[PDB]
């Protein structure tokens with residue numbers, strides 16, 4: 019499951035760059051770094067929430 | 074957005090003091106070899122600052 | 124013997140430290156060199172300057188070289204003086220001697 023979560027967060031920041039919202043992308047990237055060091059899956063929920071605010 | 078500046082987001086290990094790693098080899102996040110190809114659990118290690 | 128190659132790999136990909144004594148001087152480079160399987164682009168450092176003892180150490184940041192030249196591996200004792208401190212921020216796991 020962790021592998022899919024990392025892929026989803028990665029795709030979210032990639033999209034945020036494409037959408038022209040670099041600050042949101044930067045914030046999501048930070049979620050990736052923290053995620054790769056932890057078992058905390060709520061970082062996905064934050065990546066998704068940030069994307070929803072942008073879209 | 075100025076996307077010229079890059080930082081490394083994905084790395085297999087931490088750096089030693091004053092070590093300079095400029096490799097662009099695709100990072101393997103999963104259990105399977107990437108062989109230079111991005112995709113599920115394979116990423117280009119550098120992310121831009123927009 | 125003219126020189127040495129130091130790095131993680133000796134096949135491009137990663138920067139390698141090449142130290143070569145040729146004719147009149149010593150040429151030191153840290154380019155991502157493509158080496159031959161029998162030796163004898165991206166550069167961050169370049170510098171250009173019987174029993175010969177050398178010591179090579181890789182501390183964080185610097186690559187340290189010590190050396191001593193004495194007249195004549197015979198039994199005896201001497202100490203090696205420092206030669207050069209190279210500010211090369213690379214990973215070294217293997218090396219090769221160039222003849």
Ligand SMILES: *[C@@H]1O[C@H](CO)[C@@H](O[C@@H]2O[C@H](CO)[C@@H](O)[C@H](O)[C@H]2NC(C)=O)[C@H](O)[C@H]1NC(C)=O
Nearest residue numbers: 085086087088089092130131132213214215216
């Ligand atoms: C120098 O590079 C070597 C590889 O060429 C590194 O060794 C690898 O380290 C990773 C991460 O811990 C391991 O998963 C690999 O199995 C190791 N490979 C080998 C052949 O040992 C080494 O750690 C690097 N040195 C420094 C200081 O970063």
Ligand SMILES: *[C@@H]1O[C@H](CO)[C@@H](O)[C@H](O)[C@H]1NC(C)=O
Nearest residue numbers: 143144145146147148150151
């Ligand atoms: C020593 O090698 C360098 C290349 O690294 C070359 O430019 C130089 O001319 C050589 N020295 C002599 C005396 O040929």
Ligand SMILES: *[C@@H]1O[C@H](CO)[C@@H](O)[C@H](O)[C@H]1NC(C)=O
Nearest residue numbers: 094095096097155164165166
């Ligand atoms: C030098 O390294 C950079 C990555 O830092 C790469 O993009 C570039 O293509 C390399 N140039 C050559 C000539 O290999």
